[PDB]
Design a protein around this ligand. Structure first.
Ligand SMILES: [Mg+2]
Ligand SMILES: [Mg+2]
Ligand SMILES: [Mg+2]
Ligand SMILES: [Mg+2]
Lengths: 103, 110, 97, 55, 250
């Protein structure tokens, strides 16, 4: 409910569209598993789509750690300092592509 | 006493004289003529099939697996198998050897 | 509070045991040992239910018949009361009659 | 709080390249790497290499 | 000279046999010492992983007897009279302690007795599961067929180094037949290893074949398996259990 959560005013971060538009994403930190069925969609994402994603919008630096983990994650870092960590645990290739595109 | 001959890579690259080598070893194994279609004779005789595939596996290092041992009825089939080639690099070695962009780094904690 | 503060000790299990590795060996003995033994003669359990699935009332009746001549006294009385109660339950109460 | 240079996911060359690219500009990377160092950093790094004595 | 093994059972008119290589264990790299063919009704059936699941879960659960038991509200000690009579005091009505509401009561719907989980599949389903699992082991390049299990030394480091060199897998199930002609070398070798197993051919099963990565059979073993598994095809109704004489059947 709105009385129980904080609230902010609608704002741009540094007046984006006024001069030049800048990609507000800095990083994507991927942590996928070599063995382990929970990271199968992310394994196929690193196979096929992260190369075209990295070529698509070059402002973003992408890291793939390839670490033993029971739940794979993606950490999205923005220009103003915020850090958004999302779990890609047992998802499709299309769901992970949708998630990294929305990030 | 006989301990540890080293492991062999599973990678394979077919040579350029494959046709001459296959016709040479079919002439050597069968002891027959060319007449019109050397690559259409059958391998139902299991001694002749064993001698051919054992000689090829001794020479070229790749050996036909059992699921493909089933499917070889002509010498055209073993010729189509020895133009397949495969590769035994790891996933990470194959991934870093792709055309990676300047903004994508990968690490391996394994 | 119900939760434990420290996570438990690591439970390490040997998957290549003696018992886990030879599990299912001499199962399938009747089919390819020309039917000298049944696979239900491999079962090691109570003398009454060795190759018999049964109900709760049927298990108690079979245990009373096959073993109840040599049970202890209090266990025999508890089995008698259990069979009486389960007859009263299964044959008089419930839905779907 | 610690610098982002000391947290695990970090590579300097890729960050300078992405800094050039997200501003939609074409920097010559040597001059940008020149621009990001500081005089205090130079003196402090030589002080660290001289308290340890490494050339 | 090569070791050729033709199938002795009658194949159908179509459906030509499937083949496999014949390796041996005397040398270190003595693969390809012969070439065998197998019966296609046994080693080339449809993949059929439903049957694998049925026979695997049957094999896991048909032997199980669980010895869990709790005491119902009539077996817990004491609890005879009615504490605090029905209408006087201002507490809740109770007719006995050791009812399942109370602390220290008996369980209302707990486990009851040593319960058995026994059921048998039809025997054609189990034989079909065995044929399916042999086909699955063949088609994925996992099956290896030997002329005779015989190692030169009989020490386990030779066996594990050979299995590493031939790229078999981390675990491998070795089968011989009849349990008495198992030679001393392979027995003294794998009696110490933890992932390598010897079984007689009577003890072949879907669970051990799935649990181990590869599967190593012998030429008398594969002839035995073809006979015992193809006998289910072209067989009558029982008419009494097959341990009785039956002029054809030994
Ligand atoms: Mg009582
Ligand atoms: Mg009462
Ligand atoms: Mg109690
Ligand atoms: Mg108590």
């Amino acid at each position: 409910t709105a009385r129980g959560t904080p609230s902010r005013f609608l704002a741009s971060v540094l007046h984006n569209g006024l001069g030049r538009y800048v990609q507000q994403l800095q990083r994507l930190s991927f942590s996928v598993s070599r063995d382990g069925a929970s990271s199968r969609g992310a394994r196929e994402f690193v196979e096929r789509e992260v190369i075209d994603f990295a070529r698509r919008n070059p402002g973003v630096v992408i890291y793939v750690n390839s670490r033993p983990c029971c739940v794979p994650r993606v950490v999205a870092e923005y220009l103003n300092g915020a850090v958004r960590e999302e779990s890609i645990h047992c998802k499709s290739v299309e769901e992970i592509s949708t998630l990294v595109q929305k990030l | 006493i006989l301990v540890c001959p080293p492991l062999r890579s599973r990678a394979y690259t077919p040579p350029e004289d494959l046709q001459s080598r296959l016709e040479s070893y079919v002439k050597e194994v069968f002891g027959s003529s060319l007449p019109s279609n050397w690559q259409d004779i059958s391998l139902e005789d299991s001694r002749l099939k064993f001698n051919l595939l054992a000689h090829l596996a001794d020479d070229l290092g790749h050996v036909v697996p059992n699921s493909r041992l089933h499917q070889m009825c002509r010498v055209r089939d073993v010729l189509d198998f020895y133009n397949v080639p495969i590769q035994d690099r790891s996933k990470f070695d194959e991934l870093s050897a792709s055309n990676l962009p300047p903004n994508l780094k990968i690490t391996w904690s394994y | 509070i119900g939760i434990r503060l420290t996570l438990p000790p690591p439970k390490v299990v040997d998957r290549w045991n003696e018992k886990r590795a030879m599990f299912g060996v001499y199962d399938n003995i009747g089919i390819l040992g020309n039917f000298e033994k049944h696979p239900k003669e491999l079962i090691r359990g109570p003398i009454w239910l060795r190759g018999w699935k049964g109900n709760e009332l049927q298990r108690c009746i079979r245990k009373r018949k096959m073993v109840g001549s040599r049970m202890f006294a209090d266990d025999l009385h508890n089995l008698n009361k259990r069979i009486r109660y389960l007859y009263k339950h299964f044959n008089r109460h419930g839905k779907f009659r | 709080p610690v610098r982002r240079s000391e947290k695990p996911n970090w590579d300097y060359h890729a960050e300078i390249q992405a800094f050039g690219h997200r501003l939609q500009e074409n920097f010559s990377l040597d001059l940008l790497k020149t621009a990001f160092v500081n005089s205090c950093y130079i003196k402090s790094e030589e002080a660290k290499r001289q308290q340890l004595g490494i050339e | 000279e090569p070791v050729l093994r033709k199938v002795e059972l009658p194949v159908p008119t179509h459906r030509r046999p499937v083949q496999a290589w014949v390796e041996s264990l005397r040398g270190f790299e003595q693969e390809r010492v012969g070439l065998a063919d197998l019966h296609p009704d046994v080693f080339a059936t449809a993949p059929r992983l439903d049957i694998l699941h049925q026979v695997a879960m049957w094999q896991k659960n048909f032997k199980r007897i669980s010895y869990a038991k709790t005491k119902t509200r009539a077996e817990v000690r004491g609890g005879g009279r009615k504490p605090w009579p029905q209408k006087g005091t201002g507490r809740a009505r109770h007719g006995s302690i050791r009812s399942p509401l109370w602390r220290g009561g008996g369980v209302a719907h707990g486990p009851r007795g040593p319960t058995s989980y026994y059921y048998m599949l039809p025997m054609k389903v189990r034989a079909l599961g065995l044929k399916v699992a042999l086909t699955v082991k063949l088609a994925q390049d996992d099956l290896h067929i030997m002329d005779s299990l015989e190692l030169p030394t009989g020490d386990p480091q030779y066996l594990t180094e050979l299995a590493h060199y031939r790229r078999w897998g981390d675990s491998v199930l070795l089968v011989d037949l009849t349990h008495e002609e198992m030679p001393q070398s392979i027995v003294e070798a794998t009696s110490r290893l933890k992932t390598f197993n010897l079984i007689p051919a009577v003890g072949l099963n879907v669970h051990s074949m799935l649990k181990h990565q590869t599967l190593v059979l012998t030429l008398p073993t594969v002839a035995f398996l073809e006979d015992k598994l193809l006998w289910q095809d072209s067989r009558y109704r029982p008419l009494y259990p097959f341990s009785l004489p039956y002029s054809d059947f030994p």
